[PDB]
Design a protein around this ligand. Structure first.
Ligand SMILES: [Mg+2]
Length: 199
């Protein structure tokens, strides 16, 4: 499944495909852009079956409902919802277009890379553990992006040797998605990513 969106400030693409032979996806995402801001999130539930989905879906729902809150507030609501669930790894990104500012918070192995035309990339290491409902010490990143920046948020189903290179070379989110096609054919795990290109 691919879904694309565009406005004056960003173009996005969401790709999601299940593990080969698996009916219920354990990954979830949420994406919403208006003329002023973007909210998005990607999550990968622990365990299997309906229980992995229950966990990542709870995140999708909370990010949509609480989108106006700061990322660390949203992720903490997500953490509380994991109590008595399998838990999930997750990443939450908010962008304010007028300021060209983004904020980011994550726990676990859902990765985020933002590539600047200047050749700088924001590429945090994964934070160990997962959202389990137990106490977290969140790390929130706040920074300015330059026009022309491109980014990806992806679950562990996408395993690419040099993701930065794909972002640098691609001229649109459709091109970057096509550039990643060889990593999507095996379907060893659920695979979810969100691409963005920022004006
Ligand atoms: Mg996974």
């Amino acid at each position: 499944m691919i879904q694309v969106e565009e406005n004056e400030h960003i173009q996005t693409l969401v790709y999601q495909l299940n593990k080969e032979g698996k009916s219920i996806c354990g990954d979830s995402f949420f994406m919403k852009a208006d003329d002023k801001e973007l909210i998005c999130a990607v999550a990968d539930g622990l365990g299997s079956g309906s229980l992995a989905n229950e966990s990542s879906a709870a995140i999708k729902d909370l990010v949509e409902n609480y989108a106006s809150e700061d990322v660390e507030s949203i992720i903490e609501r997500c953490n509380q919802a994991m109590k008595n669930k399998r838990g999930a790894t997750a990443s939450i990104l908010k962008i304010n277009f007028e300021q060209r500012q983004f904020t980011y918070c994550s726990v676990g192995n859902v990765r985020f890379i933002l590539h600047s035309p200047s050749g700088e990339s924001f590429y945090p290491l994964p934070i160990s553990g997962y959202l389990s409902g137990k106490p977290q010490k969140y790390k929130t990143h706040t920074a300015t992006y330059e026009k022309g920046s491109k980014f990806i948020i992806h679950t562990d189903g996408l395993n690419v040797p040099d993701i930065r290179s794909h972002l640098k070379k691609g001229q649109s989110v459709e091109e970057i998605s096509n550039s990643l096609k060889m990593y999507t054919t095996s379907r060893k795990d659920d695979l979810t990513y969100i691409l963005g290109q920022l004006s």
